[PDB]
Symmetry: C2
Subunit: 419 residues, 2 copies
């Protein structure tokens, strides 16, 4: 029974990626590019190195002239192009990374030039000690070596990290078109809720989901709006949802998603907002009452997650459904989260439905599979740790065979933190 | 020759840790707790839950009555029952489970009546007061590196102000008369400063405040001016400036002689990053740390990840600031180099295979293997030997994790 049917996890997820749209694009300074996804191809407009550059500190060694005693006509420096022209017989001193002049397919190495002399108060040193011809293409980085001009250095769809920001800087593309980040409105619903700042009154508890979700989404860098607590009443919900709709791309609620007097949210979404509820229940533990809706305004699509009020339910479903949704909204080609194999620390008896537990992944070095230790039963139990929950342990549903898992058994863990 | 002895990657890392301080504490709003390490035990004031609470949807029931057909009010008298939700409070005269699955309703008006199925157990599926958290109990210990769930806990117990270690402000500069800002268009003999950007990005990913000190000419006066600035204004100064060979002297000289910094090592046995240099400076009781990194752009990310980030993590109170190292397999053959080598790579799991695959992203040369995905880790290859000359596709290697997976 239920105005909404039980949706399987595999299906609930697929549904979220299908209905979640990619956001439009936007120009930003390459420094604000971390996390961003490139909406354009980026071509080089200069070579790198742009001048032949010296690999080591040495001289303008001709693999043509060879041994003969050379006239050191001066030094090539890192910051200037040599206003010189190494003619045959002579040689130019060059420090590592400095340009090479019109002389040779030169080189040296702090090894060969024994240095004959530096006459007249050793200011300059007009006497090079050259051995014999080394090998034409040895320690020179030719024009273009690292990057050629008009070369695409980063493709469209690249999810940018520090190296890419550096790469943009290398080629001087300081303004770049990227997918917008989604702005996320978060609210909590329920007459029992108080703010963390408040002192408990009878029958009430402090809202914790709102902080946990904002933090969860802030950790991925998406902007957020805190809509606060909202009563279990149609009017107040509608005003809140409307404000969220007007100021965000994704609205997240927590609380009141079951029975009848906690059924206003779904009723408000469908009846007063005319949103498309895609699923209202998913066969999972925790997160069964999890609801996902879409709403379209002037062509623009907005997405709505109504999450359970249960605190643990909240963080789990936010990680399973919201984050991947947001990763797509933001341009990531494969928005699915990474899942690794880990060994369980404790045996766990299975449940009819798939179980998700916050756990802590740890590599006990010099040993292949990480160990996954779960962080409690369904709360902060006796599990206290200096480390923060790191993965979501994903337990299969009970089969009439496979009824429970033992210590050491390989299990799938969805990574949810910086390892 | 060379003054500074060749230091192993091991001792270099240990020294950085040994000489790195742990920053002082500061009080923050709990919402600003991400990545922050508690500097106090946090105690709960109230009892969570503050009332007996339901576990799963269903009905509140009397233990005496047993199973049977009953009324749904909404006190609970003999013969009656109450409709109740997830974590909702339990009424008067109730004490049992009776969740929806074990119920089979009989009448409907609202709802007239319902029907329970077995023998109630005094206190079943009911969470007593303080079952989850009890008065004056320590929920989070001093030293806890907080994630989102820790912020949730703080909010739950109603502790909005918290004492945490300070985060380190880090200042960055580049040096070299060949560097222009990226904003600038090329001039003859010059190239764009890419390190400064990469380092700043790198440390920002970790959420520490950064300071862009800019390009400095390789001039003792200027150098000293920059160093002095970042020193007064930050806890850590990082610099790029090809520090070995020809004339790197400039920097170590200025450290040694003008600032009076203690240089702990100047060369490490690794590739890339041989010239990496590390120093401390004690000023009016306070200790600043200084990393002089090479100027090779591939050296930047590697050294910063190998030496800086672990320093910053100790500095903000993380008890074990060593990076996370995992085993993975090589996506392909790699020749070994006389010094132990570090390569950027992308870590990937292929459905139902226990270890992930480490695909390299080139040797140095700007961008070699193009991906729609950032480098995830640092491949940690051993040094070359007469007989141990290379590694094959499939072999197991250590991989340092430097990004989110």
């Amino acid at each position: 029974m239920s105005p909404f049917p039980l949706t399987s996890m595999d299906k609930a997820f697929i549904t979220v990626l299908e209905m979640t749209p990619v956001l439009g694009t936007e120009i930003i300074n390459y420094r604000d590019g971390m996390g961003r996804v490139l909406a354009q191809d980026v071509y080089a407009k200069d070579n790198l190195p742009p001048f032949p550059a010296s690999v080591k500190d040495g001289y303008a060694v001709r693999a043509a002239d060879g041994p003969g005693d050379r006239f050191i006509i001066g030094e090539s420096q890192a910051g200037e192009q040599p206003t010189q022209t190494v003619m045959p017989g002579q040689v130019m001193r060059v420090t590592t990374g400095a340009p090479i002049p019109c002389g040779a397919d030169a080189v040296v190495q702090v090894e060969d030039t024994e240095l004959i002399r530096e006459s007249d108060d050793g200011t300059e040193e007009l006497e090079v000690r050259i051995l014999v011809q080394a090998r034409p293409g040895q320690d020179i980085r030719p024009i273009g070596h690292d990057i050629k001009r008009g070369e695409c250095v980063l493709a469209k769809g690249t999810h940018m990290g520090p190296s890419e920001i550096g790469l943009l800087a290398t080629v001087g593309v300081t303004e770049v078109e990227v997918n917008k980040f989604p702005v996320v409105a978060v609210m909590s619903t329920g007459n029992e809720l108080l703010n963390p700042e408040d002192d408990l009154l009878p029958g009430k508890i402090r809202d914790s989901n709102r902080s946990t979700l904002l933090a969860t989404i802030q950790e991925h860098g998406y902007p957020t709006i805190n809509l606060g607590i909202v009563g279990d009443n149609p009017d107040d919900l509608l005003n809140a949802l409307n404000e969220g709709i007007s100021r965000a791309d994704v609205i997240i609620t927590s609380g009141g998603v079951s029975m009848g007097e906690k059924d206003y949210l779904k009723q408000v979404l469908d009846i007063d907002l005319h949103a498309q509820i895609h699923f209202g229940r998913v066969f999972m533990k925790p997160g069964l009452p999890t609801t996902f809706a879409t709403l379209d305004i002037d062509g623009v699509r907005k997405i709505i997650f109504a999450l359970p009020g249960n605190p643990v339910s909240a963080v789990v479903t936010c990680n399973l459904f919201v984050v991947p949704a947001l990763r797509k909204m933001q341009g990531i080609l494969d928005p699915r989260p990474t899942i690794i194999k880990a060994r369980l620390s404790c045996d766990v008896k299975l449940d009819p439905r798939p179980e998700y537990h916050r756990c802590i992944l740890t590599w006990h070095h010099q040993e292949p599979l990480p160990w996954a230790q779960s962080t409690g039963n369904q709360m902060s139990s006796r599990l206290m740790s200096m480390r923060s929950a790191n993965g979501l342990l994903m337990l299969p549903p009970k089969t009439e065979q496979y009824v429970e898992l033992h210590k050491g058994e390989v299990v799938d863990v969805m990574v949810i933190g910086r390892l």
